[PDB]
């Protein structure tokens, strides 16, 4: 009966950095995925292991939506089997993934002539990420693993910043990504199609 | 309703070679795949992109079964993204494949102390295979492309034979493979 609160996630005014990505659980609503694939609001809409057209004829227990922001050249790393800093340390997708990836350019809201460095990503960690693992710690990295404060030697910070100006190409421009996950194992399903 | 004629494919007395693999279309029946996974008839039962327990609650138009026979060391090539002589030139699977692979050892029926060379596979072709592509031609291969008869210089036969004895390990032993690809075939 009730409709899924999609626009609250897509028309949301503020998006988090990639390393601190956030997930909204969708339950007890009718999701019409046909209108999404038929809409030009997203420039990139990639579905893995399934066609978005048949989701309109499918039920699920709960649907999860991971919202975050990365630059253009690093959207390619939001995919199974993809390597790189974003996939290794910020957001890893499982190779047996079955879902869709959504993205669209937002230089109008996330790029300034001075540079928007509020968006940070992790470039150092002790070990890569598990699928859906989330490390929002901000502890200075060290090769030996032993905690160090001193910004004097062999101790580095784990986060680095995206510089989003207006003059750079779409490879450096901010895209706002929304990744869609599913779930069915719960014997009663709640998120169905029309 | 009608039950699926599986034993007609599994208890079959005759299996083809890999290059000449055959596909049996299954239609208008209810397949209970749960009874199959719980059976020891197959030593290898690998499903890709789907769980065998949930197949019992799904409908399909027609179900396809590719039957053929290769040795142990070549069973690994029946998989997405896998390369090799059997996978490149005899039977190629798509990286986005969605189905199940079934196999079992048949040294008691396909191996003799003298050597069973009746089973052949292709080791030469001009270009690799498409997914589900089948080249059963037996024309003498040539690198230059020019057709040649004489098997002396730069002209080779395209098929080679498996030698299946009883003294070799299970890496060299023949296994009988049944691959399943994908509204008449439903659940209960």
């Amino acid at each position, epitope marked *: 009966t009730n409709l899924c609160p999609f626009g609250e996630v897509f028309n949301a005014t503020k998006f988090p950095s990639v390393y601190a990505w956030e997930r909204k659980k969708i339950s007890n609503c009718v999701a019409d995925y046909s209108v999404l694939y038929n809409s030009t609001f997203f420039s990139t809409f*990639k579905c893995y*292991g399934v*066609s*978005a057209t048949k989701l309109n004829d499918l039920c699920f227990s709960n649907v999860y939506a991971d919202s975050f922001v990365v630059k253009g050249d690093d*959207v390619r790393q939001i995919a199974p089997g993809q390597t790189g800093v974003i996939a290794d340390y910020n957001y890893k997708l499982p190779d047996d993934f079955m879902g869709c990836v959504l*993205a669209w350019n937002t230089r109008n809201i996330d790029a300034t002539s001075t540079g928007n460095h509020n968006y940070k990503y992790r470039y150092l960690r002790h070990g890569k990420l598990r699928p859906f693992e989330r490390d929002i710690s901000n502890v200075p990295f060290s090769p030996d693993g032993k905690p160090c404060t001193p910004p004097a030697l062999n101790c580095y910070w784990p986060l680095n910043d995206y510089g989003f100006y207006t003059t750079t190409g*779409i490879g450096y421009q901010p895209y706002r990504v929304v990744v869609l996950s599913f779930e069915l194992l719960n014997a009663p399903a709640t998120v169905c199609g029309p | 309703t009608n039950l699926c004629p599986f034993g007609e494919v599994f208890n079959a007395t005759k299996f083809p070679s890999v290059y000449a693999w055959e596909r049996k279309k299954i239609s208008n029946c209810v397949a209970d795949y749960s009874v199959l996974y719980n059976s020891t008839f197959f030593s290898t039962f690998k499903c890709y992109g789907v769980s065998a327990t949930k197949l019992n609650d799904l409908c399909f138009s027609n179900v396809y079964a590719d039957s053929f026979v290769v040795k142990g060391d070549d069973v690994r090539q029946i998989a997405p993204g896998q390369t090799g002589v059997i996978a490149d030139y005899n039977y190629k699977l798509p*990286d986005d494949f969605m189905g199940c692979v079934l196999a079992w050892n048949t040294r008691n029926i396909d191996a003799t102390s003298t050597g069973n060379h009746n089973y052949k596979y292709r080791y030469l072709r001009h270009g690799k295979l498409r*997914p589900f592509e089948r080249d059963i031609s037996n024309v003498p291969f040539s690198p230059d492309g020019k057709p040649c008869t004489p098997p002396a210089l730069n002209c080779y036969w395209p098929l080679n034979d498996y030698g299946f004895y009883t003294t070799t390990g299970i890496g060299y032993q023949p296994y009988r493979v049944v691959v399943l690809s994908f509204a008449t075939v439903c659940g209960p």
Partner: nanobody
Amino acid sequence: QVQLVESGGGLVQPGGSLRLSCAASGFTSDHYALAWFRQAPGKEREGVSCIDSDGNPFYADSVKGRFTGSRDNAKNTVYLQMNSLKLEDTAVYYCAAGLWYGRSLNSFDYDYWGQGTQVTVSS
């Protein structure tokens, strides 16, 4: 391996029409999506049109109503009909294939690019 070969490009005059073909060679997958991209000298590679694996097309706003693209199921060929040409449409056009189910009008998501047939509009 994989090979993409564009064809149909040539010198044209304004107001005319063109048809471009590109053929897919080494695709070990099944339902890959296919798209058309254009690249002017010293400019960023624009997404022209993208047809998903299911055959549905998606065009950029700059060519909507002017361009028409489609795929062949039997043959590994993508076509793009270019009606009502202009002089700003002069560019080197590329076909690219992507290994997913949906659409992408972005150059960075494909992993497999063609070689590029030149399209020139003069008078």
